[PDB]
Amino acid sequence: CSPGIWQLDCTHLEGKVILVAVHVASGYIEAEVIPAETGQETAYFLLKLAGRWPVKTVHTDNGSNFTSTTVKAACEWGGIKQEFGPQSQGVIESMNKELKKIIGQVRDQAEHLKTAVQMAVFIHNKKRKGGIGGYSAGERIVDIIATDIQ
Amino acid sequence: CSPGIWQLDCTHLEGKVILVAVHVASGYIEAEVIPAETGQETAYFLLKLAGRWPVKTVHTDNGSNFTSTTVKAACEWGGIKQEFGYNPQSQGVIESMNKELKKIIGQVRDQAEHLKTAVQMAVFIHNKKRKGGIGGYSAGERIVDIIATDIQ
Ligand SMILES: O=C(/C=C(\O)c1nn[nH]n1)c1c[nH]c2ccc(Cl)cc12
Ligand SMILES: [Mg+2]
Ligand SMILES: [Mg+2]
């Protein structure tokens, strides 16, 4: 769908919180282990994401971190519209699961879970699952946004 | 020079350490306050960066964090080449961004509680900023434009 629409949600592993962001139009993802599942940490993650890509709308569940006033402020400052309401919504579920999968496969290649999370994100966005000539998630997002500039 | 070259360096504000990364060919930047100017923190930042954009070469000075083994390993895993320490197309690029970033931070400090948040606001403003505030491309649009064309 729209190039400025993102979906955010939290998953968990080893008793830690993993904040996930997905660019629905491309499948590109960004994720990070955060100290706690709060609005403060969620707001910080979003500001970084927004300063990186054209984040126009973020879809999430009614998680207290996502409905907190601090995240509301961050979205306002960044000009981001919040929404709490084709295979969508389950996309975030699939991505969360897919991420935990890749993390599982590379978990022993790194000391801390946080490092493993970043390696998994790298693998996911760099992965060329389509035949030669196809685009990875990383290439798709830059392609989608570039074409939307002109 | 190429769409895969980045320069990295640390700057300091309020007694804190800000790790800065600049995509030379576009002026696009990413920054973040880190608890300590160590290799572990630097490697983590690089891994995150590498998974988002095409990072093939990283240019830095010889700060202990940048020459560390942990950074060397992250780079090895990521397929990133390293260079420590003239060329008009790179001369003082990171230096200029450290000031530009600091200036923007000074302007939006109040809008934020901690320094960490201010930095991310500064980065947001820098990447979206247009010369004279009218038309042309911002750093954010230049990087995606440069990368997009290279893909073809
Ligand atoms: O099923 C999910 C997530 C997972 O199954 C999941 N598994 N591992 N990490 N996440 C969901 C993600 N967003 C939602 C909104 C409403 C409802 Cl009822 C469910 C979900
Ligand atoms: Mg949830
Ligand atoms: Mg230095």
- How far, in Å, is the centroid of ligand 1 from the Cα of B135? 42
* Residue B111 lies in domain: 1-152
CB pairs under 8 A between A and B: 70
Cα-Cα-Cα-Cα torsion A35, A36, A38, A43, nearest 10 degrees, comes to 20
**A27 CB-near residues (< 8 Å, 6+ apart):** A95, A137, A140
- Residues A126 and B51 sit within 8 Å (Cβ to Cβ): yes
Which residue from A87, A114, A53 is spatially nearest to B138, judged by alpha carbons? A53
Cα-Cα-Cα-Cα torsion B137, B29, B126, A27, nearest 10 degrees, comes to 70
User: What's B131's DSSP letter?
Assistant: G
Q: How many CA atoms lie within 13 A of A150 on its CB side?
A: 10
Of the partner residues A47, A114, A143, the one whose CB lies closest to the CB of residue B148:
A143
Which residue out of A38, A52, A127, A135 would a mutagenesis test of the B interface target, given it has the greatest number of B Cβ atoms within 10 Å?
Answer: A52
User: What's A22's DSSP letter?
Assistant: E
Tell me how far apart the alpha carbons of residues B48 and B117 are, in angstroms, rounded to a whole number: 18
Per the CB < 8 Å rule, is A149 touching B145?
yes
Residue B1: how many other CB atoms lie within 10 Å: 10
CB-CB neighbors (< 8 A) of B18 in chain A: none
Q: CATH number of the domain that B52 lies in?
A: 3.30.420.10
Strands A28-34 and B5-13, by their bridges, are: unpaired
| Residues from B in contact with A at Cβ < 8 Å | 30, 32, 44, 47-48, 50-54, 77-78, 111, 116-117, 120-121, 123-124, 127-128, 137, 140-141, 144-145, 147-149, 151
Q: How many domains does chain B have?
A: 1
Which residue from A28, A13, A40 is spatially nearest to A113, judged by alpha carbons? A13
Tell me how far apart the alpha carbons of residues B62 and B108 are, in angstroms, rounded to a whole number: 31
Q: Environment class of residue A111 by beta-carbon count within 10 Å: exposed (0-12), middle (13-18) or buried (19+)?
A: exposed
Experimental method: X-ray
Q: Max alpha carbon distance in chain A (Å)? A: 46
Distances in Å between the Cα of B126 and the Cα atoms of A32, A51, B28, B34, B120 are 23, 9, 8, 20, 10
**A36 CB-near residues (< 8 Å, 6+ apart):** A17
3-state helix, strand, coil in chain B (%, to 5): 50, 20, 30
Kindly tell me the sign of the dihedral angle through the C-alpha atoms of B47, A57, B26, B32. Answer: negative
Phi, psi dihedral angles at A101 (to 5 degrees): -65, -60
